[PDB]
Amino acid sequence: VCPPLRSRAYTPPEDLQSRLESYVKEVFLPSNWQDISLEDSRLKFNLLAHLADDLGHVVPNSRLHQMCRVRDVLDFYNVPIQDRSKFDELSASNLPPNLKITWSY
Amino acid sequence: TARGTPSRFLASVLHNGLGRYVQQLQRLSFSVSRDGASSRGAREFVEREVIDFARRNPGVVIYVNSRPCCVPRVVAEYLNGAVREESIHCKSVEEISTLVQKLADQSGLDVIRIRKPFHTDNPSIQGQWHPFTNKPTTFRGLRPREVQ
Secondary structure (H helix, E strand, O other): OOOOOOOOOEOOOOOHHHHHHHHHHHHOOOOOHHHOEOOOHHHHHHHHHHHHHHHOOOOOHHHHOOOOEHHHHHHHHHOOEOOOOHHHHHHHOOOOOOEEEEEOO | OOOOOOEEOOOOOOOOOOOOOOOOEEEEEEEEOOOOHHHHHHHHHHHHOHHHHHHHOOOOEEEEEEOOOOOOEEEEEEOOOOEEEEEOOOOOHHHHHHHHHHHHHOOOOOOOEEOOOOOOOOOOOOOOOOOOOOOOOOHHHOOOOOOO
8 A cells, every 4th residue: 555645845843953963872972963974874874764764854865975964964954845836835925915826737 | 111000199098197197007917837948937937026016016917827838928908908918938037027017117009100209289379370370460451452
């Protein structure tokens, strides 16, 4: 059975640093944990897979190489993303009273 | 050419400036397409300019219709009943903005040869010349060679 399609929208959690540091402790602890280099493939995979499973949002292959540090991972997981259609965006962008937008799609 | 084209006189829709200026443009219907390189500029205009234009011109109703189209278009309806349909096909954001602003600033009167660059309803203030102006009057209104 195919699971229902997942929504691409992702709002960063408020307890993002706490969750990320807990996962860092689980995987790898030292001071300045944001600078823990993710050069070991085993640890990189563990951390990123745990984060993806938890948050529902995964690092794309294009950004996987540039996620070199826990700081980079934190940046990627605190930048948000939305998946609403262009119609929804335009209609929710505070359309003036004299501007009517309709989709025949 | 002028002889092969209709012509009109300089005029305003309802004396547009005497009391107050009324923007003649009333409706702007933008037929755009989700897909199709022809309407890329139209899509960018809808995203970045149409809202600003709408709020700048509160007297114009704008209808953005996104349907499958090979030639995106803009239909401008003016108070006088004139409809001007312009293709925004493969026009950049700047070109679309200039075209829309020209439509907004333009009256509904036909774009044909204007016979005179001016129009006065009261051309004369001192009295239109007639042959008897600048002609002196004679005693008892006697025409030349009249005896009595």
